Amino acid sequence: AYQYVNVVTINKVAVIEFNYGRKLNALSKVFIDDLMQALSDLNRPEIRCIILRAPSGSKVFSAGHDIHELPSGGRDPLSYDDPLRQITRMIQKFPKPIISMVEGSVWGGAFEMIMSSDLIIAASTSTFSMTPVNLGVPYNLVGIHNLTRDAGFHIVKELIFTASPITAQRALAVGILNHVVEVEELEDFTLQMAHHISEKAPLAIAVIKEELRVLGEAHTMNSDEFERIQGMRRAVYDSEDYQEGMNAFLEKRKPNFVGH
Amino acid sequence: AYQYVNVVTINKVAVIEFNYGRKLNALSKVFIDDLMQALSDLNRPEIRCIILRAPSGSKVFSAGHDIHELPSGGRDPLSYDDPLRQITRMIQKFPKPIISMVEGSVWGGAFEMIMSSDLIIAASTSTFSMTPVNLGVPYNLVGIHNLTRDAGFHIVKELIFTASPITAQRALAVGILNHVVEVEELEDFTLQMAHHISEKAPLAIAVIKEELRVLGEAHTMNSDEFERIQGMRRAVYDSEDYQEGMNAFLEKRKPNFVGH
Amino acid sequence: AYQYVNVVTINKVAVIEFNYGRKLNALSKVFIDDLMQALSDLNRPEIRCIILRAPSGSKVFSAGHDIHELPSGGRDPLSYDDPLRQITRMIQKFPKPIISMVEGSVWGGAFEMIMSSDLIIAASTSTFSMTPVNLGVPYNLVGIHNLTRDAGFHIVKELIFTASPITAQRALAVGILNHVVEVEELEDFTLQMAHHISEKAPLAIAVIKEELRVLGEAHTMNSDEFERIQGMRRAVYDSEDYQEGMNAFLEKRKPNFVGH
Amino acid sequence: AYQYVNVVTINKVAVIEFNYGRKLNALSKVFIDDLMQALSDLNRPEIRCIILRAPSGSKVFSAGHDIHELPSGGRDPLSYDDPLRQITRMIQKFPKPIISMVEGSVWGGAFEMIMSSDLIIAASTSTFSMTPVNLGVPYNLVGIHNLTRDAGFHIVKELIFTASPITAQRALAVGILNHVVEVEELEDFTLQMAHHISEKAPLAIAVIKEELRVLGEAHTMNSDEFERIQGMRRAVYDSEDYQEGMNAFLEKRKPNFVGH
Amino acid sequence: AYQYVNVVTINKVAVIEFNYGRKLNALSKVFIDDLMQALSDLNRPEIRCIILRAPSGSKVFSAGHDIHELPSGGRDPLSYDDPLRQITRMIQKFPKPIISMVEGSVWGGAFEMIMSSDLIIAASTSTFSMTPVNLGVPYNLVGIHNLTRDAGFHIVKELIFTASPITAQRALAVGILNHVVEVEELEDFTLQMAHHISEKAPLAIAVIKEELRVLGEAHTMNSDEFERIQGMRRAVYDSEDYQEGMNAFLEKRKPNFVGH
Amino acid sequence: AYQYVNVVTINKVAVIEFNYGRKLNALSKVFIDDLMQALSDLNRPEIRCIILRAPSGSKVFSAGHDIHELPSGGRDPLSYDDPLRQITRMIQKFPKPIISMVEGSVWGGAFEMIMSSDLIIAASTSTFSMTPVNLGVPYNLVGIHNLTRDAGFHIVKELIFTASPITAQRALAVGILNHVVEVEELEDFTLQMAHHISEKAPLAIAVIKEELRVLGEAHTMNSDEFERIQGMRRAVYDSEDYQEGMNAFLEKRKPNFVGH
């Protein structure tokens, strides 16, 4: 029923499995359109819990935002109706829990996507990287905020400023992951927890989830502060460095950033 | 001088011990009113630190809200002057440190109560559960907010959406607990910390505790957002699921939740 | 060049070494003025990352706020223009990452200073304490807020109410520190990470740092609540206890606090 | 095409005329559902400006909330999905200007409804009253806020505390109305302005309307404050006085309020 | 029963008449303490509306803050527990409408006091001046906020930057006053309105006043911004100019301000 | 001296007169850069009050934003460092009162500019229009906020949705202006007020001006609401209507807006 995802229903749990292996489940507009369609189709009282996953044995869970779909320069790369912006809002507003079940490496926007979900259960061999400083991308306020609700600020700044992968074991220690399991146990450990959640009161889960969403968003600022940040972001997406970051990825080389 | 608590004073440290074991120290109106009177009576310059505890050897620290006293009549069960709501505000505004010293199992409202205190020191055998999804209860914004200042969002959502107990060891790992001690060392570990705090400057403690309280509360939202959440909560406490949750608990059977 | 700091530039990384061992790198105005000038002078495109350190082998990283300079004539000791308040603003607003590379003991205002920095890498023998309750100091809102973005509320309250030192191992476990290494590896580990950061896109680093700063600050309150807190702080810095704390420190004796 | 409104379209201007004169255009659920359906049907690119009006010659523009549909005792009479609450939100979110063109007397909820619209043009004989204090109604935060964006606090508190009618001339003087015109010129004057607005850029109008909506709503408070206000409101809608106010209106007698 | 006020109650209305004309009803601690005790004594269910007035034929309604009680030698003149700050909070939180019935001239803190009240009815010969720039006083955030809810910013800035008296006619036109009437009608007009308000639902009045109070207060800012403003205010109350403003007032001469 | 403004000092008052009559004082980058330099040059203790004026006899006070300098499409026209955005911040943060003394017609950005000033004194023949809906411009949040602190919402929505001029008399009536005077009296009346202000306490004026600025900006919102607004603004500046509005102005014809 979808080109880019496969949905299986097990009792009251729906498992949405990525089927975009040819672009390593990059969050291209058409992939995200199918994932959002599949979530919408599952917004029914007989479904009580969602699992997001890559196919069994995947080396790459998701390669993150489709770098080819980023603008060439002079345009905001992460505007409100960008597909990554759409899917994080939809996950956060969805009235059922969404568990990210992670096998393989997770990159950039895909790391934000799983951080926006309710629980993360990961393989012992999974790895996690936050990548805008590799490309010169001015990440947006909402996107950064979605990275700050689990690990502390020092941990988050190390992840973003180094863009270095962290292990599942370190991700568990700093509070990013709920559980780390051997890859052979991942699917059944995650399904056991999803089935348990599915026996609980779904209207209580939905309103508690919404209350947590609203409290998590409730860091408020005045208009001048937001427009000041937007002007800083524009200077970045106008920079030579942003174009060097895009070109280095296209030419498969290490970018040379100079600070303009 | 109280029916439902025993108070011992050791120089500048006051220990408030639950005396409601008949009802597993459930947070009934008469128990909370005594606990609040005892705290009020200890608000004197000669007292510098409070310890809350269950009696030595308790299997159950507190069974949480008295489910007989939960409003069933399409009436908000966690309104501003509900005893649980009163005691958390009082604990948080109290100008001395309050340490929860936990032996036995902690449930629901009693988990929110210890989370509202300043430090938690627990026995290695103690266990912790947050239970509103078991009953279909739409936990209130302030109450949920009180669960979000220690562990991360993914961890909080696991605790609430599963309603599964966690060990003291996991509660320490995720940042809920300050210390975990062998049961036979719990009382003297907690007392030595309370005596030590009692040597420090009480006016500096009080103003710093109050500054943390107001920074912790300073997640702000507009009226529309609050009224929208209140409407969602009312749809939950009006639901058939909420009735089924209450009735199943009291009739000692598994509830059948349907999403209405 | 600078009287009170030494700067070594290695490729794109600047290492700022404290040179105030006379007062164990206490935050005297003359020392902070030199540190802020040295930071300002490093705000140039060819510098990509800063390390702050005490001299190799230091027993004391920083002894904290200069207690001789703390106002005890009954004015606010932590007003907006105080050296500690100035250096934390400058570190947070600095468009390059600032890593605190810690060897030795860290006290009070120096603990707030490293908490305000982006990443903290510490020696396994380093120790950390937050000390206002030893002196009767009413720590200000911004300074307390700077302590709340890494460890949870319960842990922060234990640190502040006890003013007890914690080990590097505990500071890592509770999420204050990024990494703990053997002293012999501290320069190698820290420089490797700083050089790595220095290959990344500096304009993306700067805007994301600023986004995190403004999100971190975005706990808002009304004027009445601020003026109320300021009145409570005044009552503390006018107290007999505050004079007793200051005198006790200068006379190298134990303060006796009485709650006025 | 509607039972309770009549819609006329003149180029880019739509006039929605009430057709509920046998209940004096009271804001009953059936009337408001037709009004909201008519607005939704007009959310089309070629419609640029809406006028809301009562029929020509109306003595009563609207008698406000249907007092027979106000919750009798114990339920919030002004919950998020109450019809008055739904229509003010829809008017304010609607991406085209909505002009209230007022002939006759305006009461209670209907006064809040025209205040929620973008412009008010009124007959010289029109009158305005805000009536919750006649009935003992605890008007909700969003609804009170909707009355505060035109005239000052003192003038708003006079209107609500007295429940006395003001003339169109006073309503113009204090900043509630845009224009006052003789009743024979009201339709022509309002249509000329609507046609003129309709020549302007609709996407600029829509985004500026939405910017004003969000700035108007951006009075934020913490969860405890909202829950405290909700507890005060519940005490009022649980009061003897609230029952007495409803009873007195329906028995056409002077209420006897006693402050419980 | 009071030295500095006279209270008369008829039916459900109380009139608090100032009795401190030998000091032109200056807001000395002893006068504010009596006014607050009189209002506290009237917080009874049978009292439903308060009027504040000067005696019949007063030239000076209130000469404002007693300049003799303004702190010199570097304390904040408008700290949270200053009598003017206490009375404005008490009026705003008082669960009954408070009408200011004004005959004569209104100065400085007394202008803030009447602005904090619910309605102002004034004689046609009344005059109003806001005076901090006369004395070099850094008016506090709450106090300035209390002046912004009636007239627009440009008008408020004219009143403050000029310190020039405005007529009752102009005060009515700009939205500061509810009504202006000839002196001989002032008491009859105000009593008619107070007695009319006292027949309305008191619990509805109280909750709506409190909702307006919290919405009015709900302009929120971060800790840094409040601390930055406080540093600015301290520099002013530490200034040459502030000492010169007070000295000039008490020596009955014109200050020479120099901007230090 | 300046190419595009003329500055006169009279005692402690500085008058900045526009000298760009060949472009009807349009807010070009070269003009704004000169006005800002002149303002910065006058930030001196011997200057107490600023007046902004057009030359005596001007038909046009300012034609507003230089339409030639708006970016053609796909670019935000009112970014943080746009000249209009810069000048309004600088006027608002300027520690001396700035009085707009208006002869002639005021358009668009020039209307936002005088609104951002402290007081407006205008000739009886002056006229005022706010014009973004003539051109299809998505005005920014800060810009709109600057139009909301004087007149009420219904009045501001009329001015913006119609783009029709208002007279000085109506602008006085709705709270936009301080004073309207005959053109022959304008200069003398404005100078007398400016000289009067110049004898008051400048430090008190500066801190109260800054308090008002921050209270004025203190309408706060979460990141998502800001980014949702920016997405809407970008849909407008990407629109065919935006291109049509600019092309119509250039080609001197009536635009044909279609809603995309």
Ligand SMILES: C[C@@H](C(=O)NCCNC(=O)CCNC(=O)[C@H](O)C(C)(C)COP(=O)(O)OP(=O)(O)OC[C@H]1O[C@@H](n2cnc3c(N)ncnc32)[C@H](O)[C@@H]1OP(=O)(O)O)S(=O)(=O)O
């Ligand atoms: C902008 C935001 C964002 O999400 N950016 C994307 C962040 N993602 C990344 O940085 C991952 C970039 N890719 C990689 O590091 C490697 O391709 C990955 C994931 C490790 C796996 O390496 P492999 O050697 O197995 O495969 P290989 O290098 O040959 O690539 C296979 C084909 O897929 C392509 N590819 C990979 N990632 C992306 C992507 N994110 N967007 C678009 N295309 C992608 C890659 O270029 C290659 O294409 P072909 O050469 O045409 O076959 S931000 O950075 O968070 O701000």
Ligand SMILES: C[C@@H](C(=O)NCCNC(=O)CCNC(=O)[C@H](O)C(C)(C)COP(=O)(O)OP(=O)(O)OC[C@H]1O[C@@H](n2cnc3c(N)ncnc32)[C@H](O)[C@@H]1OP(=O)(O)O)S(=O)(=O)O
């Ligand atoms: C509503 C909020 C809240 O705090 N709800 C309450 C959450 N509390 C719980 O879920 C704990 C429920 N109870 C249990 O799990 C077990 O009773 C525990 C506490 C482990 C005790 O086990 P035991 O085997 O020793 O005793 P047993 O199950 O036989 O129960 C003995 C009698 O105590 C009763 N009881 C227990 N808890 C409560 C309660 N919270 N309110 C009212 N009654 C309670 C239980 O019904 C039984 O009563 P009898 O039938 O008279 O023997 S919320 O959920 O957080 O939103």
Ligand SMILES: C[C@@H](C(=O)NCCNC(=O)CCNC(=O)[C@H](O)C(C)(C)COP(=O)(O)OP(=O)(O)OC[C@H]1O[C@@H](n2cnc3c(N)ncnc32)[C@H](O)[C@@H]1OP(=O)(O)O)S(=O)(=O)O
């Ligand atoms: C107010 C905020 C704050 O930052 N308070 C300060 C917190 N700092 C402290 O508690 C550390 C106090 N210092 C010490 O305990 C000792 O100096 C420690 C670190 C244990 C090291 O002992 P030593 O015997 O090795 O060194 P010694 O005591 O002789 O000091 C060397 C010279 O520097 C001086 N010194 C030290 N600390 C400070 C300080 N915080 N402020 C001002 N001066 C300090 C110390 O007095 C000595 O100077 P001389 O006696 O003149 O040689 S708050 O508390 O966070 O609110």
Ligand SMILES: C[C@@H](C(=O)NCCNC(=O)CCNC(=O)[C@H](O)C(C)(C)COP(=O)(O)OP(=O)(O)OC[C@H]1O[C@@H](n2cnc3c(N)ncnc32)[C@H](O)[C@@H]1OP(=O)(O)O)S(=O)(=O)O
């Ligand atoms: C909850 C909010 C709200 O909007 N409350 C309702 C506010 N509306 C009012 O207070 C209007 C009350 N009614 C009146 O003042 C008069 O009925 C009105 C509008 C002036 C016109 O008087 P008339 O002489 O032409 O007709 P008359 O008074 O005899 O009543 C005709 C029949 O209609 C009825 N009626 C009127 N208004 C309402 C209403 N809002 N809800 C329900 N019924 C209403 C009135 O009771 C009478 O009924 P019958 O005697 O059976 O024919 S609140 O108050 O703002 O909080």
Ligand SMILES: C[C@@H](C(=O)NCCNC(=O)CCNC(=O)[C@H](O)C(C)(C)COP(=O)(O)OP(=O)(O)OC[C@H]1O[C@@H](n2cnc3c(N)ncnc32)[C@H](O)[C@@H]1OP(=O)(O)O)S(=O)(=O)O
């Ligand atoms: C500090 C805040 C505040 O509320 N400041 C106070 C603002 N109040 C004023 O500026 C009013 C100052 N006073 C005057 O303008 C005149 O005294 C007024 C009130 C018009 C009355 O004129 P009169 O000719 O009838 O009486 P006269 O000028 O000779 O003074 C009578 C005696 O009372 C004294 N007086 C007056 N006002 C105050 C005051 N606010 N605090 C302390 N004393 C005051 C005045 O100095 C004179 O004193 P003696 O000659 O010693 O009997 S602030 O400025 O808003 O921030």
Ligand SMILES: C[C@@H](C(=O)NCCNC(=O)CCNC(=O)[C@H](O)C(C)(C)COP(=O)(O)OP(=O)(O)OC[C@H]1O[C@@H](n2cnc3c(N)ncnc32)[C@H](O)[C@@H]1OP(=O)(O)O)S(=O)(=O)O
């Ligand atoms: C975008 C923001 C903004 O500030 N927009 C600009 C708003 N300003 C306007 O709409 C005013 C546009 N101009 C007019 O209304 C009239 O040109 C004005 C002030 C009344 C004077 O008309 P007159 O008949 O007296 O003289 P006339 O029109 O013949 O002289 C016109 C020459 O000057 C030019 N002009 C005028 N205004 C501007 C402007 N704002 N930017 C650029 N050029 C302008 C106009 O195009 C014409 O040029 P030439 O005749 O070709 O030399 S927004 O709209 O607030 O968002």
Ligand code: NI
């Ligand atoms: Ni927060």
Ligand code: NI
């Ligand atoms: Ni406001």
